Amino acid sequence: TDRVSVGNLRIARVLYDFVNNEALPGTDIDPDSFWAGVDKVVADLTPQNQALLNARDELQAQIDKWHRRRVIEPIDMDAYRQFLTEIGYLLPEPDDFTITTSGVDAEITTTAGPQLVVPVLNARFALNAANARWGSLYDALYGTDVIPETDGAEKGPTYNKVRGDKVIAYARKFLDDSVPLSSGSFGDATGFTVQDGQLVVALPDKSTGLANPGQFAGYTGAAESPTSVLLINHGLHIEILIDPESQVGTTDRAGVKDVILESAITTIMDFEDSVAAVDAADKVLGYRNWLGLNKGDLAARVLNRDRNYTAPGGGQFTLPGRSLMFVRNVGHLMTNDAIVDTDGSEVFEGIMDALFTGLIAIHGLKASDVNGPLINSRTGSIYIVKPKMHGPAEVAFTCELFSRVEDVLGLPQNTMKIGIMDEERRTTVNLKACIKAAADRVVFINTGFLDRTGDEIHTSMEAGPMVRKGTMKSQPWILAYEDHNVDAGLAAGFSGRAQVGKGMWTMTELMADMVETKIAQPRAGASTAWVPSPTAATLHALHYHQVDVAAVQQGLAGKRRATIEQLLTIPLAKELAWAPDEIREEVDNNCQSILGYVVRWVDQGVGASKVPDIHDVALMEDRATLRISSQLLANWLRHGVITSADVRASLERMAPLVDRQNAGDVAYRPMAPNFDDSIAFLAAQELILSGAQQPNGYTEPILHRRRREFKARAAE
Ligand SMILES: O=C(O)c1cc(F)c(Cl)cc1Cl
Numbered sequence: 221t222d223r224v225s226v227g228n229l230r231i232a233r234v235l236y237d238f239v240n241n242e243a244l245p246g247t248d249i250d251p252d253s254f255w256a257g258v259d260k261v262v263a264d265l266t267p268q269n270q271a272l273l274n275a276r277d278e279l280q281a282q283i284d285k286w287h288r289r290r291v292i293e294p295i296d297m298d299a300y301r302q303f304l305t306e307i308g309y310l311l312p313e314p315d316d317f318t319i320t321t322s323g324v325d326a327e328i329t330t331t332a333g334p335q336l337v338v339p340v341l342n343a344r345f346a347l348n349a350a351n352a353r354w355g356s357l358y359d360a361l362y363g364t365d366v367i368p369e370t371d372g373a374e375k376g377p378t379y380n381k382v383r384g385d386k387v388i389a390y391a392r393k394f395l396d397d398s399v400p401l402s403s404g405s406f407g408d409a410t411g412f413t414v415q416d417g418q419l420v421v422a423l424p425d426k427s428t429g430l431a432n433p434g435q436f437a438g439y440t441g442a443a444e445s446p447t448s449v450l451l452i453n454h455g456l457h458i459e460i461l462i463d464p465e466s467q468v469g470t471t472d473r474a475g476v477k478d479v480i481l482e483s484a485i486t487t488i489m490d491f492e493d494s495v496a497a498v499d500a501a502d503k504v505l506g507y508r509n510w511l512g513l514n515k516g517d518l519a520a521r522v523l524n525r526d527r528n529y530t531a532p533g534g535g536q537f538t539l540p541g542r543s544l545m546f547v548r549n550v551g552h553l554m555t556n557d558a559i560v561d562t563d564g565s566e567v568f569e570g571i572m573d574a575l576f577t578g579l580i581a582i583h584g585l586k587a588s589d590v591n592g593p594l595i596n597s598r599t600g601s602i603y604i605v606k607p608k609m610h611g612p613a614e615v616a617f618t619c620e621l622f623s624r625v626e627d628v629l630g631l632p633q634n635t636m637k638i639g640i641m642d643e644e645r646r647t648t649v650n651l652k653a654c655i656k657a658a659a660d661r662v663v664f665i666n667t668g669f670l671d672r673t674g675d676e677i678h679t680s681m682e683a684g685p686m687v688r689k690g691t692m693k694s695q696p697w698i699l700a701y702e703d704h705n706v707d708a709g710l711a712a713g714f715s716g717r718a719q720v721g722k723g724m725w726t727m728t729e730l731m732a733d734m735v736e737t738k739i740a741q742p743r744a745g746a747s748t749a750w751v752p753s754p755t756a757a758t759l760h761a762l763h764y765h766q767v768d769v770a771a772v773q774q775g776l777a778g779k780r781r782a783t784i785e786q787l788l789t790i791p792l793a794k795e796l797a798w799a800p801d802e803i804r805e806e807v808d809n810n811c812q813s814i815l816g817y818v819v820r821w822v823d824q825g826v827g828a829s830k831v832p833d834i835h836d837v838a839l840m841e842d843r844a845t846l847r848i849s850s851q852l853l854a855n856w857l858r859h860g861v862i863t864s865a866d867v868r869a870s871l872e873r874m875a876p877l878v879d880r881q882n883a884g885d886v887a888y889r890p891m892a893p894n895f896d897d898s899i900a901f902l903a904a905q906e907l908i909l910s911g912a913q914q915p916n917g918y919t920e921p922i923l924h925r926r927r928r929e930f931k932a933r934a935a936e
Pocket residue numbers: 337338339490493494668670723724726752828840841842844
């Protein structure tokens with residue numbers, strides 16, 4: 221082979237080289253000592269890693285048997301709850317505590333606003349996301365359906381003044397709602413000046429300042445004739461750009477060219493569910509991008525620099541031009557043959573990710589010629605989101621892993637902070653303890669609701685048929701799950717200390733709907749929530765101007781809005797819930813969902829994209845959509861809702877539709893009609909028919925295998 225031997229490990233040459241030639245230089249870490257650390261950490265932590273996975277299996281078998289061993293139709297909750305306690309699934313709740321995590325940037329502790337997640341393997345998207353800290357409100361309004369395309373404001377191949385004027389009006393209104401004038405409206409402004417460190421806004425008949433002069437943060441250009449005016453509200457910046465000479469400015473009553481919102485305050489560069497990375501070459505491509513981001517020299521076109529302003533008084537000052545970056549590592553389950561041992565066994569991927577993404581992150585703490593010019597964390601922290609954990613022992617293990625990595629890296633202990641995903645049932649019902657296990661490292665918790673639903677289905681697979689996928693988002697268990705997560709964070713002292721986050725808006729083209737409905741998230745006390753794009757970050761930023769999250773959080777303090785019984789309410793369908801046409805509809809829906817995603821993943825190594833659903837609505841989901849759909853169909857198969865012929869026929873009907881939906885794609889290769897020849901189609905089928913047998917319903921073992929199979933076929 222072409223592997224490098226280091227103790228018990230045999231490292232893929234492409235990885236070894238990348239680390240030696242690209243990652244290590246500038247860190248001052250001894251290369252032979254680094255690799256020695258890797259071998260040691262992998263040797264030391266692998267058994268515990270394996271033990272935790274086996275414990276998941278042990279637990280699930282007992283739940284399976286408990287369900288199968290009874291006939292009693294409605295679930296006896298008292299008995300169910302004491303059973304879960306007995307087997308160590310439901311652990312005792314620790315006493316009240318407050319997190320002690322320190323050295324955390326203000327973007328995480330304090331500022332509430334949109335959080336962007338992007339696939340790290342896409343250099344363009346990662347670059348765009350990093351730059352999405354600031355975004356044009358006008359572009360976001362003009363370019364989406366937030367402004368209706370009425371029989372008067374329809375987007376053409378060129379600028380529509382009717383549409384533009386509506387964009388302007390909408391933004392003027394946002395200004396009045398967010399930074400009110402002491403009298404009158406921004407809609408009647410005729411100019412801006414800075415007089416005696418005070419913002420002066422010219423009306424037709426008077427001048428006025430702001431109701432709160434403190435919202436005035438600064439300006440650019442001459443105070444007599446500002447080029448722009450900087451404002452602030454709920455910790456987020458708003459910039460009014462002034463340019464009468466501009467295409468839009470000339471039509472504007474105050475010469476305003478645009479309104480810029482501070483949008484994506486933080487971004488998560490994702491190595492997990494939004495990417496397809498099944499071997500060393502794929503991991504390296506991701507590691508190299510994360511490196512470029514942390515050095516500040518990634519280009520594909522370049523990262524933005526910080527923003528220069530003049531304080532109201534006259535001093536200069538500067539603001540971050542880039543989103544503060546987290547990285548999301550893979551979780552505890554998978555191995556990757558990037559490194560194998562002597563036996564040829566693959567090394568745990570989560571362990572590797574912590575070592576390599578952690579090493580790379582050192583560059584984001586420095587600014588030089590070898591380290592690149594750009595800084596990520598000014599406070600000295602590295603932010604790692606850790607997905608798919610099941611319970612406090614698994615959280616503890618990640619923290620011990622980070623400690624071991626810190627030692628290998630020569631970093632202070634607790635440099636490596638943890639963003640805890642609450643997306644598995646055993647974490648949900650033990651959340652307070654999971655937080656305690658990371659009490660000196662935790663910088664967020666977040667409800668990963670799609671993975672969570674997949675776990676919900678798989679955990680109770682033997683209980684009975686589940687409700688339909690669309691119904692899941694309004695079931696009692698998930699609404700309690702959402703409220704419980706906020707309760708736990710706040711009680712652990714997250715306000716002012718750590719983010720409380722909610723899930724991804726997936727309908728990329730439904731921006732009107734997003735602006736209308738996603739406001740529920742900060743209203744529920746989430747200091748952040750996920751958006752899929754810079755445009756969506758800008759629009760979701762509107763919500764944080766309308767909702768005072770800090771005040772909302774203050775008011776939820778001390779309240780306990782979900783019981784353990786509510787969390788434990790399994791989403792079983794009532795008897796005779798569905799007509800046969802509705803059953804067929806749900807099957808087709810889920811099969812299309814699986815095919816649509818699996819085809820891009822297996823054939824093109826794409827893990828996130830705009831996939832049209834069965835009704836051609838554009839969704840940008842990640843691998844979790846596969847977990848839910850495959851588990852639901854497996855559940856329906858298992859309890860006799862549908863037959864194996866039903867499933868095959870739906871896959872066979874949905875496949876040509878998926879093909880057609882991908883018609884504008886040069887590299888696309890159709891699944892229909894030779895289904896046994898399509899690795900993609902068979903992967904889809906395998907996810908379903910083997911669904912009930914996958915550990916906690918996880919799709920990676922099958923997906924990875926099938927993607928590796930596709931790459932191997934392609935290589936000849
Ligand atoms: O929920 C997630 O983990 C997620 C992450 C992503 F990066 C994207 Cl594009 C979509 C989702 Cl649904």
